Amino acid sequence: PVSETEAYIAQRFCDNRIVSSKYTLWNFLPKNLFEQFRRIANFYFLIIFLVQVTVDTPTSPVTSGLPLFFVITVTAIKQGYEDWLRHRADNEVNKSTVYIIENAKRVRKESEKIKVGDVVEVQADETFPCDLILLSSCTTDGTCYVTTASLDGESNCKTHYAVRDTIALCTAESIDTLRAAIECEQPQPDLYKFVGRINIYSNSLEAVARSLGPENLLLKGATLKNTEKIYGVAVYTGMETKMALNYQGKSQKRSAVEKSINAFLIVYLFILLTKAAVCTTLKYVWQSTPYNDEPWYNQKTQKERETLKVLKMFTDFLSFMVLFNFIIPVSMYVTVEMQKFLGSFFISWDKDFYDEEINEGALVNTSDLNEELGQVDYVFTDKTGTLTENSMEFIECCIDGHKYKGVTQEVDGLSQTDGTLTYFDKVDKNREELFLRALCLCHTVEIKTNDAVDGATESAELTYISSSPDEIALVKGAKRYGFTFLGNRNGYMRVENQRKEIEEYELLHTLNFDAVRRRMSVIVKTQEGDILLFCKGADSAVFPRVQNHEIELTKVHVERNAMDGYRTLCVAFKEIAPDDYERINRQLIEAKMALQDREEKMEKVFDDIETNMNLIGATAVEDKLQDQAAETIEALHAAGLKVWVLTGDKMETAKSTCYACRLFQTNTELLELTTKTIEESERKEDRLHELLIEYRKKLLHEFPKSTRSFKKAWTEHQEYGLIIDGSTLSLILNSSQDSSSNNYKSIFLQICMKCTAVLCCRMAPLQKAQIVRMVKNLKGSPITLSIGDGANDVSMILESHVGIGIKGKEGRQAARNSDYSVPKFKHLKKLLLAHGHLYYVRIAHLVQYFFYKNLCFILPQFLYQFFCGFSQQPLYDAAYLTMYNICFTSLPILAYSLLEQHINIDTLTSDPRLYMKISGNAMLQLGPFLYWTFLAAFEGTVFFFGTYFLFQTASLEENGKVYGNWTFGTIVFTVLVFTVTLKLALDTRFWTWINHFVIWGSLAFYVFFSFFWGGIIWPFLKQQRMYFVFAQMLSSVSTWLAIILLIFISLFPEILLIVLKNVR
Amino acid sequence: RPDNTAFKQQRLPAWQPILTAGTVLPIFFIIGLIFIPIGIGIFVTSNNIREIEIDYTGTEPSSPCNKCLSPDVTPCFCTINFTLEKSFEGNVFMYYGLSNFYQNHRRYVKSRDDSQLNGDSSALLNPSKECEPYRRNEDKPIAPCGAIANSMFNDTLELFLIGQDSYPIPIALKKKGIAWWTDKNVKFRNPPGGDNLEERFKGTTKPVNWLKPVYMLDSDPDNNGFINEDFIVWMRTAALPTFRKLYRLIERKSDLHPTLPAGRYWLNVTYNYPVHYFDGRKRMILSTISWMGGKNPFLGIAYIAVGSISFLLGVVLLVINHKY
Ligand SMILES: CCCCCCCCCCCCCCCCCC(=O)OC[C@H](COP(=O)(O)OC[C@H](N)C(=O)O)OC(=O)CCCCCCCCCCCCCCCCC
Ligand SMILES: OC[C@H]1OC[C@@H](O)[C@@H](O)[C@@H]1O
């Protein structure tokens, strides 16, 4: 319902902008903060900080806040960079140069400011900035040509027309044209229908479909061709695609490993809790009754703060946790973000995949899902735009299986250079005449009349414009041969056989291409004789005629052609008599000029007219790929990944290129869920199990079983899966709440799963998101990766666990909406097969390691309480505890994460079978978790016990002296760092010259700093607990021989493992 | 093509060393062949060393010091006869060992105020807050500001020898260097200045339990004020429920005779440190030393095990992959 004011233009409507950003300019902090607190570590330390405001506690609020804000901001910056990047990428396309002149400004405006009800000029080869209403086209008949390969993904072109003409030349110069107005209604998101009126009694109707539909209304990204300039109004509809994409408005921060980070923190928090409980309780009970004031060394002010029966219990509970809270690590987020970010450029500034065109090889969108890239299980791909482009071409026709093709070669170089005077006609000038003649005829082409300079391109512009490019390429093939097909508008397809001969023919009648028959024919009168009958037809729709002379030759070649993914088009003709032709003529017009149910009468008569023909070969045509099918699809199949294709292109060409990509094996007993839609509304209900429950288990128990780890060899795979249409899907999805005998969506996924692959034809972006969520729930949770070209499947980029986009394939706008961009389907192999999986090994080793260090560091700090009067007296120096631990821990491990390939990229690229299957998610499952914790125990217990054992004498020094408390603790700290560092060094494989320096350099930092601190900086500072204590310790050769044994025993099980893990 | 470098395309020089069974196999063998002897060595070495300890706490009326345990006349005395079955020529060391004395304790170590100890000017003026209980007494600044200093180990001991003449024969001892060079000369020194000792502290009282001040402990001033080695060694928190502290030391004479011979010895003490109030013992331990130290066969057997274990491991590791 739109007023569409007459004297005025518009107001009170939603203009068009670009919305592809996560956070907003104003409320970003309330979004980023809540999204950031889903990480427990931050939550636990913030609640601890909050609690440290009740009463006086030994730990200061600053040392409690600093761990949080130093982490919160880092993520905030590496989240901001991302959102601001998307903001700039959106503004650039927002302020796009757009030609428009309606109100007053004669100059051209920007796409950022285009209100509703504005005429917009769309020059030739221009992308529609928005969706408009068209009733004024400059060229004659107000007809232009537009393709929609990004909106709905149709391969066939769009036909449309208008009433007026070039009214714009008068809109700028005068206001007389601004008389009419348009009324609208509550805008609907799907965009299938939009209705109204336009200031006169006339119903301005329109409606979309998955096939060629709307004429009046225009859409975004609808590429314009064969026109000069067109003018349309009502820009508000551009928001339709926005409302079609908005499904993915806010579901951003996640990961497959960051979920396990919190799950890890669960048992870790329980570890803390357990230790705090044991320490506190076992103190109160063990020494609380008689040792509180008896020792007499100390006497607290006011008898332990008037011995509050329970307040002391709580004050010490905290005193224990805050000292034990290192178990729960928070410095692991800053380092993990440094990996996530500094690892992004590995794909950006990379020549491994750079388009030779200025087109960028890759773009990085988010710094949050890098680690989970090479960890996918399910993939959702697209056909047109990604696997191919909106076009098609013909190659190597088969006239009785005689026509072949060749090239220049070493031995056969003489015959290919110059054409011999005898080889020019062996099987050509015998039947190729009628073949190419029939080709040029029986085609609703209707080519252009004018043309540009003939010679700009290879020959001429030669643009034949029809509804679908199915036969638009066949005429181009005829052009490749001697034929040309010039004009044909008022003449019977004038053509040239080989030389420049006109070859004019008269078009008497032309038959239609209906769907029940599936054949196209024409009746023409030749200039040198009688009447003929040309026809092409489908595969099993024309082979009905007997054709005794030539069947096998064409049948087997058509079989192999269709198997290889071609669109086989047979061709035949027949000789009509002069009088029987009049009989057919009369009986046909008796149905045409009959106005009583012509759809049935006309069909029956013109279907029985063609009773036989003469088969003259066949023509195979292929919808070329974008990259080789086998490497991209074969590699994923071997790597394990389940490959599915959910597209928006016609089913015929869909089945065609899918069969061409070899995902549809030769012997795949396919299943369909689209031909039984109009009939038997409730049969599908009792059909699903009859086709999947009955057949799958039948062939599964007929022959031996089929395992889950290795497959694709036994006759079980014979039974391929299925292909569904958007109708049956939305019919088995939302209205499956009627019958309760057996679930329907459940069995639908049951069949969609156990098979080779599946295809979802006639699928909308929203309709594809439903399949994404369909697989995102069964059997726990697998990982989903999606990739598409334009705005049709862009509504899947975020619904899927990871978004991968291709720029410029159809619509680029879809890439900036994605999480990653790679305008190369071939190079997607490198992305998830190498750069991502590496991120997984990198950060997985990183997390197991971070927990390992903060546990081997504090476990002795806990067991020491057994000998300390549970007065939480740290064995470690005050600053030494935090300072050197974070000054060492972060450096070498971050080096591992940033630059380390447990196995190199090329050796893993060459073989995915031994690459992805071994990984899985097992890097941090309870298999390796409990194994690593054992290492945490063994070293944390050996450090402490070993040192305490050697301390049973008080005579370590070569001369014999006492040994201070901090000496013992600084002994365990030492064996600790040496053990963790050397441990990582033994676990690493890639020894780059800049990692080798940091490992040894950090251990150096240890010796160097601890020695410098021990000797000069004592009297200038505030206070020091140990002066020349580190050296006083290093003065007893005993400790040398002891600490070396401690680190060796600490790493002995790791050495053993290394041996096992690398042998057998 | 334009911005390509090795760091940006993971193609840097990789040292890439890779291990396997045949590569570590010798490591285990070699480390065994090196550890087994080194361990057995430190074992016999730290073993031979002869030590001895005696608990002079009483806790048994059978022992002569028990009747001197509970609050008795202030200067309590007791003798504990002990025999020396063996004579150790190595220059001996004397330690006083105690039990159930939780040196390592937050409240016990936080009371140490390095300021008064080091000998700072503004220190003597005001003691820090960490020494919350013993800051002052009757509003007068204490010089050794700390519970550790307050709880000094003062009970002194005296050791004699018995020969063919039943009457005693004392043994000479040296007070120099009972603490390390650093913790005595650089770590701590006297207040800003003074030629005499008393002037250094004008209006400075002493620890509560301590009756006689620190400026009246040792004759020579290089071992009296805040630099008294006995007190300094006690000012080192051992960090164990039971621990040993070096009291004095009897080094060997520049001559070749044996320092301590075999025979009966006399031990007399001055009981001035109560411990039965918390069921804690008191004792003295005398012993010889070496490059390793007193009796501690831990490292020995530890090396023996680790070595033999790694060795046997290699044995299996070899006799298994040799089947190829
Ligand atoms: C510009 C340079 C600045 C340099 C720093 C300046 C420092 C000024 C700080 C002033 C604060 C003064 C606080 C009062 C003194 C602290 C006393 C104290 O530590 O209590 C310790 C008490 C001890 O309990 P317990 O005996 O083990 O319990 C036994 C139990 N009943 C049982 O047997 O079962 O356990 C407790 O109940 C705790 C009571 C409160 C403790 C408060 C201690 C704070 C000291 C400061 C520590 C600083 C740490 C670093 C902070 C960094 C800040 C950036
Ligand atoms: O009996 C406990 C003694 O402890 C302190 C001392 O100064 C005396 O005042 C007191 O009698």
Ligand SMILES: [Mg+2]
């Ligand atoms: Mg798409």
